[PDB]
Amino acid sequence: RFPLTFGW
Amino acid sequence: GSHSMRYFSTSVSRPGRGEPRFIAVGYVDDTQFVRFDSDAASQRMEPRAPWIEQEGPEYWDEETGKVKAHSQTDRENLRIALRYYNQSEAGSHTLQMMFGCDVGSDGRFLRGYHQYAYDGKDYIALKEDLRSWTAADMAAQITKRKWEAAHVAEQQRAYLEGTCVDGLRRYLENGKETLQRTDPPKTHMTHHPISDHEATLRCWALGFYPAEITLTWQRDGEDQTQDTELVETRPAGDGTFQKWAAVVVPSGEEQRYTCHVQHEGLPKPLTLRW
Amino acid sequence: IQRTPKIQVYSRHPAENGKSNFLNCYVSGFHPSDIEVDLLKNGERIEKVEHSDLSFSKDWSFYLLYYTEFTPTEKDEYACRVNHVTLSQPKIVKWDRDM
C-alpha cells in the first residue's frame, strides 16, 4: 500500500 | 525471518523537454512487486510479482490514485526546490523518496521510514520516534516548519505503526511460497593462476535469497579484511542473487586460506577450503 | 551530487556453450540517473536488451539490471558498454566467464 505524502 | 516493505520514488526534471520523469517501485524484502512509470503507456500502477495479482480492481485503482497524486506533488516539490535555493530552471534536478516499515518474525512493528533526497543528498526524513523530522539544510528547515504546523507526523506515525505493517503481513501471507522461503547459496571455489609467483582464489555464492550475505576470507584462521577483492552483491535476474570474494595467494599457499559464508538460509555457517 | 557507476557484466547461470542463458549487466551506485548501457556481441550492440525499473540503495545512489537471452559459444565475444556524465568516454567491459 503506497504512502500518502506532503508538499515541500 | 525479519521482513521489510519499501517504496522508492524518483522524479527527474527535464528543463524544456516535458514534465519530470517519475518512476516508482515497491518491494517486499528483495522482491519487487509493483512499479509506476509516468512515461509508460499504461499510466497505471503495475504488478511485477505473481502474487500481488490476487488483489482486486479496487486495490489497483487506489494505488494508482496515490502514486499519481504523489507524482504531481513531486512536480511542485521540484519547482519549490529551485525557489528555495534560487537555481536555474534550465538545470536537471533529481528528487527521491523512500518509505516503508519493518517487522520481525512474529509480525510486529519494528521500524518505520519516510525520507527524501534532493539531488542525491539527504533533504528531510522522519526521525525514528516518528514524531519529528530531521532537516539537512536551511531549505529543508522551511519544509519542516510547514510539516510541524500541518501536524503531518501524527498521520505518518499512525500510518506506519498501523496500516503499513498490516499491509506487510498481508503481502507476506499472500506471497508465501515466494517471500517466506529462503534460498541458500550454492558455493564453490575457483583457482586462477596469474604468474609463476601468484594465483587467485575466488569464492562464489550463487542462487541465493535474500540478498543479505557475508563472504569472509581467512588465513590460518586470521581475517583478511584488507587484501580481499569483493564484488557488490548482484541479482541473477531470476529472483536469486550472487556474490564473490577473491584473494591473491602466493603459489603453494592455497591451503593456508579458508572461505567463510553466512546467510540466513544456512543452518550452519560454511567453511570452504581449496 | 556525483557518483560513477560500478559496472558488472556476467551470465545468470554458469556458462555452457550451446545452452541458452542470460547476459546481465548490472550498474549500481551511480548518480544522477541518466545512463546508457549497451550489450555487445563481438562489438556489435545487441538489439532487444531489457532493464529493471530504476531504483536506488539506502544511500540514494541508483542501480539497474540490463539483460538479454543469449546462447554463448567459445567463439563469441560479449561485452557491456556504459556511459554517464562521470565517464569521459563510454566504458566497455568484457564478459569473463570467471570475472
May I ask the CATH architecture of the domain B182-274?
Sandwich (2.60)
- Residues contacting residue C34 through CB under 8 Å, at least 6 positions apart: B12, B92, C84, C85
Range of the domain at C29: 1-99
Residue of C nearest to B33 (CA): C53
Quote the strand ranges of chain B, DSSP E: 3-12, 21-28, 31-37, 46-47, 94-103, 109-118, 121-126, 133-135, 186-193, 199-208, 214-219, 222-223, 228-230, 234-235, 241-249, 257-262, 270-272
- The distance from CA B62 to its chain's CA centroid, rounded to whole angstroms, is 24
What is the Cα B266 distance to its own chain's centre?
Answer: 23
CA–CA gap between residue B206 and residue B187 (Å, rounded) = 6
CB contacts < 8 A, B to C, total 70
Tell me the CA distances in angstroms from C8 to B56, B177, B193, B216, C37, one per residue in order. Answer: 39, 30, 22, 21, 11
Contact A7 B81 (CB under 8 A): no
Q: Looking at residue A4, what DSSP letter applies? A: P
Domain tally for chain C?
A: 1
Angle at C80 between CA C35 and CA C78, to 5 degrees: 160
The residue behind cell 533526497 is B117
Contact criterion met (CB < 8 Å) for A7 and B146: yes
Distance, CA of B258 to CA of B252 (rounded, Å): 14
Q: How many CB atoms lie within 10 A of CB B171?
A: 23
How many Å apart are CA B167 and CA B63, to the nearest integer?
13
Establish if C53 touches chain B: CB-CB under 8 angstroms: yes
C-alpha cell at B71: 507524482
B51 closest CA partner among B75, B26, B81: B26
Beta bridge partners of B248: B200
Return the SS3 of B174: helix
Structure determined by: X-ray
The CATH number linked to C21 is: 2.60.40.10
Task: Tell me how far apart the alpha carbons of residues B255 and B246 are, in angstroms, rounded to a whole number.
Answer: 14
Q: Where are the domains of chain B?
A: 1-181, 182-274
Please state, in angstroms and rounded to a whole number, the distance separating the CA atoms of residues B160 and B126: 11
| CATH 3.40.50.2000 describes domain B1-181 | no
Contact at CB, B94 and C24, closer than 8 angstroms: no
Omega cis (within 30) before C90: no
Q: How far is C60 from chain B (nearest CA, A)?
A: 6
In a mutagenesis test of the C interface, which of B242, B243, B244 is the best target, namely the one with the most C β-carbons within 10 Å? B242
Distance of CA B16 to the CA centre of its chain: 31
Residue with grid cell 538479454, as numbered in its chain:
C68
Question: Hey, is B211 helix, strand or coil?
Answer: coil
Q: How far apart are CA B236 and CA B205, in angstroms?
A: 11
Yes or no: say if B242 and B234 are a contact pair by the CB < 8 Å rule. yes
Find chain C residues with C-beta within 8 A of B23's C-beta. 53-54
> Distance (Å, rounded) from C-alpha C5 to C-alpha C23?
19
Minimal Cβ distance to A3: which of B80, B114, B124: B114
What is the CA angle B174-B178-B183, rounded to 5? 150
Under DSSP, is residue C69 helix (H, G, I), strand (E, B) or coil? Answer: strand
CB half-sphere exposure, C33, CA atoms < 13 A: 26
- Alpha-carbon gap: B118 to the closest alpha carbon of chain C (Å): 9
User: Best mutation site among C12, C52, C60 for testing chain B: the one with the most B CBs within 10 Å?
Assistant: C60
The sign of the torsion formed by the CA atoms of B129, B133, B135, B141 equals: negative
